[PDB]
Every structure is written in C-alpha cells, then in structure tokens.
Design a protein around this ligand. Sequence first.
Ligand SMILES: CN[C@@H](C)C(=O)N[C@H](C(=O)N1C[C@H]2CCCN2C[C@H]1C(=O)N[C@@H]1CCOc2ccccc21)C1CCCCC1
Ligand SMILES: [Zn+2]
Length: 90
Amino acid sequence: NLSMQTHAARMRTFMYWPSSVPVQPEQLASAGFYYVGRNDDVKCFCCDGGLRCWESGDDPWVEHAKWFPRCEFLIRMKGQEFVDEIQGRY
Ligand SMILES: CN[C@@H](C)C(=O)N[C@H](C(=O)N1C[C@H]2CCCN2C[C@H]1C(=O)N[C@@H]1CCOc2ccccc21)C1CCCCC1
Ligand SMILES: [Zn+2]
C-alpha cells in the first residue's frame, strides 16, 4: 500500500488485468487505484476504498467521489467542489 503512492507503481499492478473489463488501467491508476489481483477488484492507495464490477461508461474519478468522498488524494486532485457536486450538494 505504501508502495502504491506513485502512478507508475499502481500501473504495474495491472499486468494481469483482464482485457474484457470495459475500464482501462490508465484511467484507474490516474484516479489512485491499483489492482488487487482478483477479478476486477481495485483499491485506492490513499483511502483504501475498494471498487469492483466496473461497467461500460464508468469514470473512476466519479466513482471515487461517489463512494469515498472524504478521500484526501481525491480532494487534492479534483477539489472539494467536484466532490460536493457528485454528492448532489450544490
Ligand atoms: C458500477 N460501477 C462500479 C465501480 C461500482 O459502483 N461498484 C460498486 C462498488 O464497488 N462498491 C459499492 C459501495 C457500496 C458501499 C461501499 N461500496 C464500495 C464498493 C464495494 O463493493 N467494494 C467491495 C467491498 C468489499 O471489499 C472490496 C475490496 C476490493 C474491491 C471492492 C470491494 C459495486 C459493487 C458490486 C455490485 C454493484 C456495486
Ligand atoms: Zn481514495
């Protein structure tokens, strides 16, 4: 988990990511996620939030904010305003 603080390190976890999942490693790693090595389960290096069952059209930053809105990495990258909006606070 400490070794997942860099984008390149998270990317390397996707070596055996199934090609049929309709979400790409690059999008996932950019949003703080790394592959835990089973099915399509990923976790955030910062908040330890886990996501799975990726769907066509999913945006990992939106999903991050939907489910883990207090994540500090998410807040620092996208800002509190983005998070509030995803949470339906205007
Ligand atoms: C459809 N888009 C995906 C990203 C999505 O919304 N996934 C949800 C999810 O990952 N969630 C849902 C939220 C609800 C409360 C917090 N949950 C976090 C996350 C989830 O299910 N994570 C599991 C929890 C058990 O531990 C792990 C470990 C690794 C990966 C995922 C999870 C799914 C899960 C499976 C069926 C449909 C919703
Ligand atoms: Zn997070």
